[PDB]
Symmetry: C4
Subunit: 219 residues, 4 copies
Amino acid sequence: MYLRITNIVESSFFTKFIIYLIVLNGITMGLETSKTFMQSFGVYTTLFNQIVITIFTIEIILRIYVHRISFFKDPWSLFDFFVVAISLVPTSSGFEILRVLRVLRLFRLVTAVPQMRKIVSALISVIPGMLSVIALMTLFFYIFAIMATQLFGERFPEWFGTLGESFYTLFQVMTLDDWSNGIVRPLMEVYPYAWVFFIPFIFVVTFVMINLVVAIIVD
Amino acid sequence: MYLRITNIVESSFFTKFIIYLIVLNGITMGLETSKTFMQSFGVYTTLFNQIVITIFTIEIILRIYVHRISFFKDPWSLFDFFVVAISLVPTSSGFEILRVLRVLRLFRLVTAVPQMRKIVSALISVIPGMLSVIALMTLFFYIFAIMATQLFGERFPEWFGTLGESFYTLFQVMTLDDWSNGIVRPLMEVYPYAWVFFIPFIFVVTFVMINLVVAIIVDAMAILNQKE
Amino acid sequence: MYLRITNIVESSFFTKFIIYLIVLNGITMGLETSKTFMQSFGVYTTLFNQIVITIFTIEIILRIYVHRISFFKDPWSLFDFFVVAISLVPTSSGFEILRVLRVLRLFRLVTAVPQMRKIVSALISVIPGMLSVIALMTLFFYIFAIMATQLFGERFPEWFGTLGESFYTLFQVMTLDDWSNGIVRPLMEVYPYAWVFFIPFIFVVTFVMINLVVAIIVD
Amino acid sequence: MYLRITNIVESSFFTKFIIYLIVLNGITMGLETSKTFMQSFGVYTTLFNQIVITIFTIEIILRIYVHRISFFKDPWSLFDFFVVAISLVPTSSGFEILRVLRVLRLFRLVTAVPQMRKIVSALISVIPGMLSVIALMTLFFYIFAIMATQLFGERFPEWFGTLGESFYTLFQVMTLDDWSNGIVRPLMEVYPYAWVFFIPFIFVVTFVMINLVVAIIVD
Ligand SMILES: COc1ccc([C@@H]2Sc3ccccc3N(CCN(C)C)C(=O)[C@H]2OC(C)=O)cc1
Ligand SMILES: [Ca+2]
Ligand SMILES: [Ca+2]
């Protein structure tokens, strides 16, 4: 019976099945939004999700006594194991933040299609060489986030009242969200010189992300 | 009669005549925008529309009698057809939008003028060299558009009321438009943990698009070498 | 005498001398922008300006003697010409910009100095490569501008009232400057489908801009 | 006795003793941030820092002997001398921004750890190749930065008062921060053709900003 179930799971049709059904829940989760549909077609939907989730649980189980060691030595499987388990945690308890986390099974659709796997890995390909740069960036912030909190955060706390408030803002500025009228002009009107912070900060921090796509296109 | 009309079509005149009308109608359309004009020199242009449309409607039939089966298997032709024909839509009734789609006719400057046709072909070449990632986004976007509506849109109705409003808002944040003060800071006053739906939804967005583009440079770069 | 006026001009002294006048008139006008400086030194500095032109005026007469027709067959020189053709014009009457166009002079730091010439004409040299596209956009821009203008200029005339409005507003959206909340959500208050003009327009324009750079990068 | 102090300073323990101190006093200054942490355990914060500055002024006097002439001709040390010197000023009088610089030391985690040094110099490196077109633009940003002050400074004072106020603004227009509604849309009410002034400017400053980026990609 070991090899009967091995053919079962690894078949074209078990794939087409699970992929058809990832697609389906992914239209019903669409329609769940509709707060009218939830009156008209409400109940079909709520247990459709339980119907589909068990299938996935067994699809996960069927996969596991086949591969064994092999299964959890795959990132995409593990994430599927991770994702559908996230949904096995009950609707009650914990936080709602578990109810809405659930909808990460649509990433399952991604892992299910090998074309997505091909391209998604190209995207994760690129990351590590940037860990060099990436994790300096993550300190320039820390250093410069602190300077702000003490400098401003008395008078302008929403923005820099805090280690973490300074971060959220310095990010804000990094992306040049609405930093000009929104964030320095109002400061200078109290602390006239804080342009010696940000114009510098804006310089370092666009520079780096520029010499990021340069040295991204060498790999 | 075929090779007689097959001569009216291909002539250096007929293209220089059809094209030079496009320009001559652009100007014309650049003046249907003051009210001043439609007052004084109004019906003047009202029917100059009606002229340059007949000139095309016929022309498409001429090429259809030349190329025929060849005509509906070229993109640039199929466009001129569609775009002329959509102008054939009637002035009265219909929909007020179809009355405004007209100045798409000014796209035949692309289609007739040769150098503009070439760039378009260049520019449309990159498309499927990305079309996986184009999808990967709308899936990702989708999984993130629900997630928004069932979190925020209860309180914050305009921004995240529906699938629709969530997507559009989630686009806004992509261009990095007003996003922090304008959309998220507000979310933080009721929901201090929204910088977890967003500072990430950011990097992911701007990791991809950067790779979407280093692709464009790469696929376009990839074609250059390796021929030795 | 022709071959003295050739020698006076060609000297490595002459250039240094010209570049000295510019880089003074450069410093001098920084101080002209000030409010207080023109109280005190508004005597000398209104003098000094009128010399620096008188001299460059001579320089053009001589350099024309030297190269004759080769003068108005050279870009860089014509720029020196028309920039100085401006400053001559008397101080009062007509438009107030001709008295500000004065500062256009300072760009003689570029023409005069080789390696400013080179990197400037290195920039400009891609424009011929870009006609093939600027053409197309100004066709695209002009075309949406018409549609925008009829469709919205009735309820939103400060923004889409004429062509002019529509162009700048469309020029805005292209810089993703406050397009959404600023310009479009207000439009969705009255014309709900504007996300189908404004998004897609927004797509295309950036599309181009990327592929613009992906052939500037081969070129 | 000279080569005994030259055979510890160079070792891999003396080094990891700073890099670890760095990382502790690095962690400590983010705890200062907490207002709760300053009236609970502020004592060990004041001292830990106090000891660190002892260790570091010792370290630096220790590396001066081993290195001497090799020391005061290195970037990373002239950095480290001043970056630490700053924390030794009396802390009374002067300016309170003396006291804030004290966190520029946590930059040393970059100095004293070699991968960061080669990732950091991988950016300073491609800076002498750019200081050309940093000249061309800083020229433009001046020339206009005059006109702006003298086309809109009597009435549009905040944004364009002083020469400076023209700088801080045009940069915001350059960063494309809120420019159109923020800045141009308002000027246009009083002076209508300000788009002619600004809009071109926003071609020049971004074209150059794009090609100067291409000049990075082949070199
Ligand atoms: C954190 O680092 C960042 C921050 C922001 C960006 C945005 S991403 C974006 C999203 C959608 C359309 C375009 C953009 N572009 C490209 C086109 N744009 C230049 C006109 C950007 O450059 C960035 O926007 C700007 C001008 O800051 C990129 C990296
Ligand atoms: Ca803004
Ligand atoms: Ca903006």
